[PDB]
Write a protein that binds this DNA or RNA. Structure first.
Ligand code: MG
Ligand code: MG
Ligand code: MG
Ligand code: MG
Ligand code: MG
Ligand code: MG
Ligand code: MG
Ligand code: MG
Ligand code: MG
Lengths: 138, 190, 345, 199
RNA sequence: GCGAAGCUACCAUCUGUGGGAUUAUGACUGAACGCCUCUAAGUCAGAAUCCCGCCCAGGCGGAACGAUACGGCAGCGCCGCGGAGCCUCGGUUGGCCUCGGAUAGCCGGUCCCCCGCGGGGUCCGGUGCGGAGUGCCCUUCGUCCUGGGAAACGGGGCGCGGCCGGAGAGGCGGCCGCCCCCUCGCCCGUCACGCACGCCGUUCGUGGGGAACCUGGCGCUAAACCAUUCGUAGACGACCUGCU
RNA sequence: CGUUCAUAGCGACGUCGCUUUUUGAUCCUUCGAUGUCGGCUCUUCCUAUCAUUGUGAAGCAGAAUUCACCAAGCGUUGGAU
RNA sequence: ACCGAACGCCGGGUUAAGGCGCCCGAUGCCGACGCUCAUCAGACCCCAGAAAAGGUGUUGGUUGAUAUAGACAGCAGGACGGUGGCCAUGGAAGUCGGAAUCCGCUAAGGAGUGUGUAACAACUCACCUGCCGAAUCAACUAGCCCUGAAAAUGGAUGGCGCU
């Protein structure tokens, strides 16, 4: 019941490979399993890239099926894709997963302390909510 | 090789309503519901239109044997619609050279006893596929009518009583005896 | 090379390790299927083969050459005095099998019965179940007893009742009543289990279980015939007169090359005393035992509507190697497995 | 310390492989709901293939013979033991760590039970291929306790529904409680989203 | 000659069973191939076959229940809490659970409707390279002092009594009364704790599993084997029985 | 050939195979010895199916019958020389 | 007896030939492109096993065709006259066989594919239409798969297993 489609000018996040973590707007599909791809703004060269690697986004900027780099660049910068990406939940939870990984052993401790407490202030509030739902039932 | 897309439509008419839960067409209308699961066929049943006017069955990257389902699904959906709207009426005459084939339904259209086939003492009790109902005909003499919504269930139940009446150990070129299915039809034409 | 002249094989493999049974009393290896619909009742009973005799009867299978002709017909008598239900016992279904679950016993249990919980009654202080039957006469226990039942009422799938014979009443020498589990097939598990709870410490006579003209299955252990040679055991051919080492043998065991001998080859070992489950023994009669009202009523046994004498089934000079069958009995058509005095399920 | 894998939706010899190697490294493994396990290739095919295996037996004394277990648990455990060195001590020591079950019984009905995706049908078969369910295959080949296993497992799933429902309720309370509380936990929760959670 | 008992004969007499999957085949629907086709996706009938049932055996496999050595020296079973002292070793935070789907899912809330605080439905709103994420979650890891804040009625006494749920191999929880004690998490102030002088098996599950030894309280009061007997048994053992 | 009709059942001239229940080739194994034929008895296995189950075929009207499939479950006998 | 490589006792490093689900050291690569489903799948020098011949199973090629001048299939309409054409009479007026093998009307029908006849008759098989409406068909060829494919203790891609 499909939603994201390999189109000309669909933007693709590259799961893995050389250019992992980069966006890229498909110019054109060469083959059953291989697309000719571009990432003008994103620091990715006009190059063929297989589908295997490129999981694909909800965006689809609009240029012609065989563009000349300038024009897909223009399309990109118009739609402000790079902003829109970065305000997506997806790209935020990439950054999240980046920031836990960066965590210094000091920060780790800090966090640990924080959550230790932040969980306690919830767990009591949950207890209360449970106690109050029992009173309503009675 | 692989084929980048094949697909097909089915005009559901305004008389019928069809839904689909996932890949499980459900058809209701005049005569009642008729569901059919197509988990086992690997297609995108896009129901589309306001007034829900047509079913559409995609098939991306199909190789030859994969594509060939696309139609067959669609065809099963028409026949669903047909039974909901019209019904299926499989007529079957009895054919005998000597011993007349005494038929007698029992419960409603469920059971079918079939005495004196070939002079056989053995009576062939034949239940139906549930959802179908046999009856005897008036107007035409040696003749049953198997009315039902589900084509499959009807036809199967027909065959059952077609097959019950076979001859063992004799030449079936000569011994042309039994109930056989004369006509595949509907309960009301329009 | 092949066997020139074919023949069927001697014996049946589907009965073997032709070994001396592990049990004496014949196990019901499979009770019938309970349904729902039909009232609770036991599925089986326990008897003692007294002996045999003729019967004469009119026979009404139309079509025969014996139709409404009298025949004589063999029967066994099976001395079958009433059982006592002592315990109940729940079974739970599992993917492993049918695990036994919760066994209650009655307050009182006869010595007849308690014998069986000892190898040597002469020596024993007779202390079994002493500390158990305490339960049946306080509050705490009697509550636990109900919970023990009500657990079975929820969980258990199958409930059989335990019973035992009334060895007392038999002429037989032994005093140790055979115990047994006997399955209750009938209504829902609760209803089932309530029926058993009513039956506790109570008599259950033959008539309650079986009815006349009813096909039953006898189970019991064969008459035992010691070690035997391949000839009497497997009914292989005797070799011919000239045969330098033995002629009650099997000439060639196996061929050469699967160079072991097989289980399928006829060897010499225990003959008889196997466990065996016969089926389809009709019940030509179920006799009421002896009893009184002012004088005895011995007549009622071997008497018929066409004899109307005063005979007991007890033949003259007693059943041989048995005694007087004073109690109620079942009269199966034909033979039954096993010997006089044998406990026959 | 224990691996509990839901045998369901795995490929017989695929999961076995992983299990074997684990079991030999000294991981106590429990597989569970084996009868869910499904073997690649169509049914008739595999039934025939089990029926070969039943044809095998020592002529002279079958009793000694290849012991054809019928229970889908055993059947899995047999195929692990084929991927072990079971004559040795270390192979038998390993095999004593594997624990298998016909359905999923009390110690592991209430355990988060893993999945190996490398053994998973939905990953390793193409979706246009046939496959037996082991449950069926056992059944037709002589296993008794199918229905009993099934009908206990309905009772398991009903009981689990309840557990899940009640979990859902606590999760909803937590969400509500954080929304109640947020302002007094702001200068924690903030730090957990500067160091990469919550987002 | 005739012959009890016993063994015994198609040389007498009795008993001998029901399912499931399907094979070949014939078919249904039905595309590929505007028609047609048992076939491709899907469905049927189907057998001396096959597998199971009944039947025989019963695993270095389990079960429930009984009794558990009064004594003339005894010896043990629970319970709780102590002292040493061989041996066997692994380990060196936990995760207390929906079902499942994959050409789809997950969660909400129902304004509204049906069923037994829940279940089902529709509708709408959210997520969905899964953050109501095992790429996860929980838990903290020095000890104490006093003297502020944020957070605050939470924790304990192997604290004590009642009411539950759990049978697949339950073996674990939960919830309710009463007694006494404490101020724990998060920030900070404020000092001190062999600081053993750079250096290894540290750190725990742990009162671990097994064996022998010293304390209290409450319970207990044997069977088995042999010999003897029997003959439903038997080469011998074994088996079946009897004995204030 | 089969009234006719190549293929119901057959199959020349040609040709390709399998099998080791025939016999040959061979001489590896054994000559400090593997008891040399039949029959008898007993078990088991195979199928290349005579019979029986369920089936397709005919020059199958029935009866009898060949041809082929699934099939080795169960049978396959007493005698004269 | 093949392939690699030829040996004092050892430490480190590297290789060959072969390998790398697990047994079993190594693919626990987000390896690449195809093909292929087997109710007897296949799975590696020597090697321990199969052929001719088939298959709208599928996947490639090769060469021809067809065709909006209106197709291809699918149903519907006709299938004649010169003419018992010549030889053969045992009867062959299309129809056991064989040499022939053209014309008319033609829209178009062969001196005739079969079925059937003693022989006819009767039936059947081009050219064109109507509904219909764009692509469609034939012959070869080679890859995997299948058919061809039967033996005796239970059994061996080394095993488990693998789609
Ligand atoms: Mg023979
Ligand atoms: Mg001699
Ligand atoms: Mg059947
Ligand atoms: Mg078929
Ligand atoms: Mg079927
Ligand atoms: Mg001819
Ligand atoms: Mg020898
Ligand atoms: Mg054959
Ligand atoms: Mg005939």
């Amino acid at each position: 019941v499909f939603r994201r489609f390999v189109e000309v000018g669909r933007v693709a996040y590259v799961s893995f490979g050389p250019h992992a973590g980069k966006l890229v707007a498909i110019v054109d599909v060469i083959d059953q399993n291989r697309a000719l791809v571009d990432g003008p703004c994103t620091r990715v060269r006009r190059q063929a890239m297989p589908f295997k690697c490129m999981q694909l986004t909800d965006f689809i900027l609009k240029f012609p099926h065989s563009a000349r780099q300038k024009y897909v660049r223009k399309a990109w910068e118009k739609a402000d894709i790079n902003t829109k990406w970065a305000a997506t939940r997806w790209a935020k939870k990439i950054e999240a997963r980046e920031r836990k990984a960066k965590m210094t052993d000091f920060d780790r401790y800090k966090v640990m302390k924080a959550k230790k407490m932040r969980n306690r202030i919830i767990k009591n509030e949950v207890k209360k909510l449970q106690r109050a739902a029992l009173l309503k039932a009675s | 090789m692989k084929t980048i897309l094949s697909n097909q439509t089915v005009d559901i008419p305004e008389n019928v309503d069809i839904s689909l839960k996932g890949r499980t067409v459900i058809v209701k209308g005049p005569r009642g519901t008729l569901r059919r699961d197509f988990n086992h066929i690997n297609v995108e049943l896009s129901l589309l239109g306001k007034k829900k006017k047509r079913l559409r069955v995609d098939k991306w990257w199909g190789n030859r044997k994969e594509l060939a389902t696309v139609r067959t699904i669609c065809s099963h959906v028409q026949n669903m619609i047909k039974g909901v709207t019209l019904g299926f009426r499989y007529k079957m005459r009895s054919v005998y050279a000597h011993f007349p084939i005494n038929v007698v339904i029992q419960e409603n259209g469920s059971l079918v006893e079939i005495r004196n086939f070939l002079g056989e003492k053995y009576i062939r009790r034949v239940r139906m596929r549930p959802g179908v109902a046999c009856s005897v005909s008036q107007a035409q003499k040696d003749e049953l009518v198997l009315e039902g919504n589900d084509i499959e269930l009807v036809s199967n139940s027909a065959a059952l009583i077609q097959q019950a009446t076979t001859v063992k150990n004799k030449d079936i070129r000569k011994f042309l005896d039994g109930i056989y299915v004369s006509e595949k039809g509907t309960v009301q034409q329009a | 090379s092949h066997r020139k002249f074919s023949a069927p094989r001697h014996g049946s493999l589907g009965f073997l390790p032709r070994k001396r049974s592990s049990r004496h009393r014949g196990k019901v290896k499979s009770f019938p299927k309970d349904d729902p619909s039909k009232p609770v009742h036991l599925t089986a009973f326990l008897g003692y083969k007294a002996g045999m005799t003729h019967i004469v009867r009119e026979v009404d299978r139309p079509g025969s050459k014996v139709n409404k002709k009298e025949v004589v017909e063999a029967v066994t008598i099976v001395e079958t005095p009433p059982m006592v239900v002592v315990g109940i016992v729940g079974y739970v279904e599992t993917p492993r099998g049918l695990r036994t679950f919760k066994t209650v016993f009655a307050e009182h249990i006869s010595d007849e019965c308690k014998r069986r919980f000892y190898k040597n009654w002469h020596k024993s202080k007779k202390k079994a179940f002493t500390k158990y039957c305490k339960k049946w006469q306080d509050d705490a226990g009697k509550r636990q007893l109900d919970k023990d039942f009500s657990s079975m009422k929820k969980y258990c799938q199958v409930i059989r009742v335990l019973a035992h014979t009334q060895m007392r009443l038999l002429p037989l020498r032994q005093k140790k009543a055979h115990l047994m589990e006997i399955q209750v097939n009938g209504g829902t598990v609760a209803e089932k289990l309530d029926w058993a709870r009513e039956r506790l410490e109570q008599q259950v006579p033959v008539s309650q279980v079986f009815g006349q003209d009813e096909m039953i299955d006898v189970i019991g252990v064969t008459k035992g015939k010691g070690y035997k040679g391949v000839t009497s055991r497997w009914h292989t051919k005797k070799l011919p007169r000239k045969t330098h080492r033995g002629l009650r043998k099997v000439a060639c065991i196996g061929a050469w090359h699967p160079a072991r001998v097989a289980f399928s080859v006829a060897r010499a070992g225990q003959k008889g005393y196997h466990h065996r489950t016969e089926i389809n023994k009709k019940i030509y009669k179920i006799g009421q035992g002896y009893l009184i009202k002012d004088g005895k009523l011995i007549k009622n046994n071997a008497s018929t509507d066409y004899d109307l004498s005063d005979k007991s089934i007890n033949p003259l000079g007693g059943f041989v190697h048995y005694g007087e069958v004073t109690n109620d009995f079942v009269m199966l058509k034909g033979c039954v497995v096993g010997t006089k005095k044998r406990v026959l399920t | 310390q224990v691996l509990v894998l839901d045998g369901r939706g795995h490929l017989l010899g695929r999961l076995a492989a992983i299990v074997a190697k684990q079991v030999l490294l000294g991981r106590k493994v429990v597989v569970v709901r084996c009868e869910g396990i499904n073997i690649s290739g169509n049914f008739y095919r595999n039934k025939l293939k089990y029926l070969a295996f039943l044809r095998k037996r020592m002529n002279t004394n079958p009793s000694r013979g290849p012991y054809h277990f019928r229970a889908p648990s055993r059947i899995f455990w047999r195929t692990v033991r084929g991927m072990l060195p079971h004559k040795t001590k270390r192979g038998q020591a390993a095999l004593d760590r594997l624990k298998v079950f016909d359905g999923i019984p009390p110690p592991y009905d209430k355990k988060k039970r893993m999945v190996v995706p490398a053994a998973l049908k939905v990953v390793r078969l193409k979706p246009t291929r046939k496959f037996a369910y082991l449950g069926r295959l056992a059944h037709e080949v002589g296993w008794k306790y199918q229905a009993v296993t099934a009908t206990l497992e309905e009772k398991r799933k009903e009981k689990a529904k309840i557990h899940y429902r009640k979990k859902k309720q606590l999760m909803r309370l937590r969400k509500q409680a954080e929304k109640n509380v947020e302002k007094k936990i702001d200068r924690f929760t903030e730090v957990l989203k500067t160091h990469g959670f919550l987002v």
